[PDB]
Design a protein around this ligand. Sequence first.
Ligand SMILES: *[C@@H]1O[C@H](CO)[C@@H](O[C@@H]2O[C@H](CO)[C@@H](O)[C@H](O)[C@H]2NC(C)=O)[C@H](O)[C@H]1NC(C)=O
Ligand SMILES: *[C@@H]1O[C@H](CO)[C@@H](O[C@@H]2O[C@H](CO)[C@@H](O)[C@H](O)[C@H]2NC(C)=O)[C@H](O)[C@H]1NC(C)=O
Ligand SMILES: *[C@@H]1O[C@H](CO)[C@@H](O[C@@H]2O[C@H](CO)[C@@H](O)[C@H](O)[C@H]2NC(C)=O)[C@H](O)[C@H]1NC(C)=O
Ligand SMILES: *[C@@H]1O[C@H](CO)[C@@H](O[C@@H]2O[C@H](CO)[C@@H](O)[C@H](O)[C@H]2NC(C)=O)[C@H](O)[C@H]1NC(C)=O
Ligand SMILES: *[C@@H]1O[C@H](CO)[C@@H](O[C@@H]2O[C@H](CO)[C@@H](O)[C@H](O)[C@H]2NC(C)=O)[C@H](O)[C@H]1NC(C)=O
Ligand SMILES: *[C@@H]1O[C@H](CO)[C@@H](O[C@@H]2O[C@H](CO)[C@@H](O)[C@H](O)[C@H]2NC(C)=O)[C@H](O)[C@H]1NC(C)=O
Ligand SMILES: *[C@@H]1O[C@H](CO)[C@@H](O)[C@H](O)[C@H]1NC(C)=O
Ligand SMILES: *[C@@H]1O[C@H](CO)[C@@H](O)[C@H](O)[C@H]1NC(C)=O
Ligand SMILES: *[C@@H]1O[C@H](CO)[C@@H](O)[C@H](O)[C@H]1NC(C)=O
Ligand SMILES: *[C@@H]1O[C@H](CO)[C@@H](O)[C@H](O)[C@H]1NC(C)=O
Ligand SMILES: *[C@@H]1O[C@H](CO)[C@@H](O)[C@H](O)[C@H]1NC(C)=O
Ligand SMILES: *[C@@H]1O[C@H](CO)[C@@H](O)[C@H](O)[C@H]1NC(C)=O
Lengths: 150, 409, 172, 50
Amino acid sequence: LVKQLSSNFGAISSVLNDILSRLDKVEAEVQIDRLITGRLQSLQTYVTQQLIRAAEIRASANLAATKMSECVLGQSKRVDFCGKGYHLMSFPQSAPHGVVFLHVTYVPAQEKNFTTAPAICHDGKAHFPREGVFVSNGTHWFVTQRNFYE
Amino acid sequence: AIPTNFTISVTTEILPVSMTKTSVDCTMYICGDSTECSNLLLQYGSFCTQLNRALTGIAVEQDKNTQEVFAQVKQIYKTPPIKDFGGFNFSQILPDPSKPSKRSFIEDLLFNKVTKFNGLTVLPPLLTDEMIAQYTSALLAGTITSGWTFGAGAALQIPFAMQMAYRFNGIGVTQNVLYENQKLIANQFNSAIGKIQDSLSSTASALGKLQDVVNQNAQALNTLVKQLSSNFGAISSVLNDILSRLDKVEAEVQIDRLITGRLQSLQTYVTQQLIRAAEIRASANLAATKMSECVLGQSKRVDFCGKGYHLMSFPQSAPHGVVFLHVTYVPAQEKNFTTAPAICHDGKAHFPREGVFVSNGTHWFVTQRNFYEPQIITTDNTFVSGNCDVVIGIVNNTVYDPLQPELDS
Amino acid sequence: FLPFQQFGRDIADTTDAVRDPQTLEILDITPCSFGGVSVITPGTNTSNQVAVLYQDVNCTEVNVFQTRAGCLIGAEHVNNSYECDIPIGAGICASYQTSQSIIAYTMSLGAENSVAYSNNSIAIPTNFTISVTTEILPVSMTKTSVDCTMYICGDSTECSNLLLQYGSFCTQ
Amino acid sequence: TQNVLYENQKLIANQFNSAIGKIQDSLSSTASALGKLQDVVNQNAQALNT
Ligand SMILES: *[C@@H]1O[C@H](CO)[C@@H](O[C@@H]2O[C@H](CO)[C@@H](O)[C@H](O)[C@H]2NC(C)=O)[C@H](O)[C@H]1NC(C)=O
Ligand SMILES: *[C@@H]1O[C@H](CO)[C@@H](O[C@@H]2O[C@H](CO)[C@@H](O)[C@H](O)[C@H]2NC(C)=O)[C@H](O)[C@H]1NC(C)=O
Ligand SMILES: *[C@@H]1O[C@H](CO)[C@@H](O[C@@H]2O[C@H](CO)[C@@H](O)[C@H](O)[C@H]2NC(C)=O)[C@H](O)[C@H]1NC(C)=O
Ligand SMILES: *[C@@H]1O[C@H](CO)[C@@H](O[C@@H]2O[C@H](CO)[C@@H](O)[C@H](O)[C@H]2NC(C)=O)[C@H](O)[C@H]1NC(C)=O
Ligand SMILES: *[C@@H]1O[C@H](CO)[C@@H](O[C@@H]2O[C@H](CO)[C@@H](O)[C@H](O)[C@H]2NC(C)=O)[C@H](O)[C@H]1NC(C)=O
Ligand SMILES: *[C@@H]1O[C@H](CO)[C@@H](O[C@@H]2O[C@H](CO)[C@@H](O)[C@H](O)[C@H]2NC(C)=O)[C@H](O)[C@H]1NC(C)=O
Ligand SMILES: *[C@@H]1O[C@H](CO)[C@@H](O)[C@H](O)[C@H]1NC(C)=O
Ligand SMILES: *[C@@H]1O[C@H](CO)[C@@H](O)[C@H](O)[C@H]1NC(C)=O
Ligand SMILES: *[C@@H]1O[C@H](CO)[C@@H](O)[C@H](O)[C@H]1NC(C)=O
Ligand SMILES: *[C@@H]1O[C@H](CO)[C@@H](O)[C@H](O)[C@H]1NC(C)=O
Ligand SMILES: *[C@@H]1O[C@H](CO)[C@@H](O)[C@H](O)[C@H]1NC(C)=O
Ligand SMILES: *[C@@H]1O[C@H](CO)[C@@H](O)[C@H](O)[C@H]1NC(C)=O
């Protein structure tokens, strides 16, 4: 925007005082009008870009507020909304013109291949887990939590 | 009213993700191959480079949108050669190895529905249709073979029927309903997919949300080009026709008239593109949100990923967009049952641990809220708190104690 | 062309074709090949070597690698894929690697992996790790304010009086 | 647990009814409550006047 003050826009000079100090009114008003049109257009361009950028910032701020409410104040069931992993808790940190969230997540680290089954027959009855899944270590059947071998 | 039967439905949600990456050269558009016009244009400073910058920013954000929507998986997963998925047929959404581009049948259907000299160019996307198809293949193979585990961390293999059992538990329906009705569920799923294929193969308007984006950008460019035909007060719209007949002094004035008009035309175009780009970005952010919370996980958000109780979703690529196939559980048939909030027994007030109390007119049962499956009311189904003189609408019945006959013998 | 037609025009009113005034044949006028020129470069704190992309042209009209993004000159084509560094377009990215030089390659989409799926095998985690990630979001931007009179006219009454003929353009 | 509601159902209904009455009293007395919508009306009207 400041650089635009250096443009002539068709005028004999970009410096308004240099136009006024050398030419009398009648034609000088024309030369000034050329600069007014160009500089006014420059401001309109600047303001339009700022309004669009401001809309972008507002969307980001709304997202940040949403995360603050549903991650720091609560616990998020939304996948990858507050970082990768199963969300536990988050911590806000301030930053210049922004906010930084530290997302604490639970990530499975080591796994084993187990044989499974959807149900077990006993006396003709079909037994299903109340919680967890059925696993076999190759000789014995166990019931264990879905997200942690126990 | 408690549902006694259910139907598995598949819905299609179509979202724009990107728009054509145009770039406009102000000198060739405004002046072309004319130095006199270019020299006049230089008196307007940076008006051009701010337009090249704005369009570059848009072009970059079109690739950012695609990457955030599709590039959510660190690895490219692939299905096994044996499709033992419990009766669920995925052959119409998985890559077809026989095509020159490994797209699914449905993706091929989607691509068949959506259809320079003045300084106006179109940049290629960074991610080709091949790269997008591979990404949707990886996301689909992960979803099918590992459920939601590939989203949080490592892809942990699980039988598909058990994965669906978890998805059913996630909506308040005990996993045993799925296994007892597994064949029915697989047949309903396969039929729903066939219906999706028939719709896409017959309803052209299905992809209107993406076609309109294509139309809006194309028309805008046509409008910009049409503006070269305007005089803007000059004796002629053709710059060379002005330069070849008039000498410098007045010709510079006639050229200035065209520069002002054409520069205004570009500014209008760029402003409209920035606003439209913001719209596309919001849509892409929504698509990425759905991808993360529907395909990689399971959504508890009502109507976020289609109507019904969400089970799973499948991404499909489309021209300048993404198509989600949302698999939902919808109650199908219901009966009128009499209910009660609690039952008095020995003065104790019994409440269900899970489910509600129902009566068929002669006997009281406890059943799941979302699926009629009557069980005998027992001490292992209900809990005691307080007594019958507080709860409004409490009824008299008996609660069977499974331990009593065990102690008598 | 019909016997009375001498010139053809495009949507922009530029000449599309002309009929030669001496020999009555039609010549199409296609403006000669042009395009944007982009420079692919590592930062100047690392190297002053660059590659040049001539957009949407063949390398004949201008070692040399023809891509659908254009003719890339100065970057060596490498068969090995990598993570995208400096994007070019159409699946091609470039980077500065090992002497050292600029390379061009088809970008990798991630490691290839298969899931050991079967109808009776489940993988259940036995251990876990607690990870912390950082998410950075903009919230605000500098609260600028611009005075149209000082910007446009400054300390000049004659200009201000002319500006008043434009009404509310400023106060908006 | 759902038993809390049933044991306290009368209290809950009375609190709900009172809260609604408070909403009515606020809307009947606080003009600024709908400012978010009035500003939209004002922004478009002024723009046309401009
Ligand atoms: C599967 O788990 C069971 C239970 O832990 C194992 O059975 C035990 O094996 C140990 C020897 O490692 C014996 O000392 C115990 O008496 C066994 N208990 C029972 C109840 O049998 C079984 O060996 C494991 N199998 C495999 C292949 O790991
Ligand atoms: C639940 O609804 C399904 C259909 O949505 C029923 O399945 C149909 O059953 C009839 C038997 O009268 C068959 O002729 C149809 O071919 C079946 N359709 C499918 C898709 O399998 C099912 O029987 C219903 N169950 C109950 C208990 O009402
Ligand atoms: C999954 O559904 C597709 C639907 O097309 C099945 O493909 C058809 O299979 C039948 C016989 O198996 C052929 O006669 C058709 O020509 C096939 N159609 C197409 C388009 O390929 C596929 O076989 C089904 N898979 C399973 C395992 O049942
Ligand atoms: C309500 O359900 C109960 C339990 O299913 C029904 O009682 C059974 O009725 C059948 C006849 O249809 C008898 O053969 C069983 O011996 C009954 N069992 C018991 C424990 O009483 C009862 O008839 C049903 N009532 C209605 C109106 O449907
Ligand atoms: C539910 O059962 C209780 C007791 O089994 C009933 O309470 C009796 O009500 C009658 C009539 O009001 C009294 O005369 C008895 O003295 C009460 N007995 C007890 C132990 O409180 C109660 O009325 C029954 N509810 C319904 C709806 O029939
Ligand atoms: C689970 O993983 C943790 C590391 O993430 C293991 O803790 C390490 O155990 C080794 C023992 O071999 C120590 O030398 C390391 O210092 C431990 N690291 C930390 C951070 O405490 C843990 O033992 C693993 N548990 C199982 C059952 O595999
Ligand atoms: C499970 O078995 C397959 C069979 O080849 C193997 O490739 C895979 O690595 C095994 N899983 C683990 C966690 O070792
Ligand atoms: C429940 O009873 C009402 C009583 O008229 C009836 O209109 C309604 O259709 C019944 N519900 C079902 C599912 O039949
Ligand atoms: C339900 O309504 C009937 C209407 O006559 C009434 O007699 C009965 O007591 C009511 N029950 C409850 C729990 O409100
Ligand atoms: C970039 O230059 C600065 C200053 O010379 C240097 O400190 C920094 O490490 C350089 N960056 C890289 C990636 O080498
Ligand atoms: C010109 O570009 C086309 C692009 O497809 C290429 O096939 C051709 O070989 C290039 N060179 C020519 C025409 O000499
Ligand atoms: C790269 O792969 C192509 C495949 O056609 C091959 O012709 C070429 O020689 C390879 N380059 C090197 C350096 O191996």
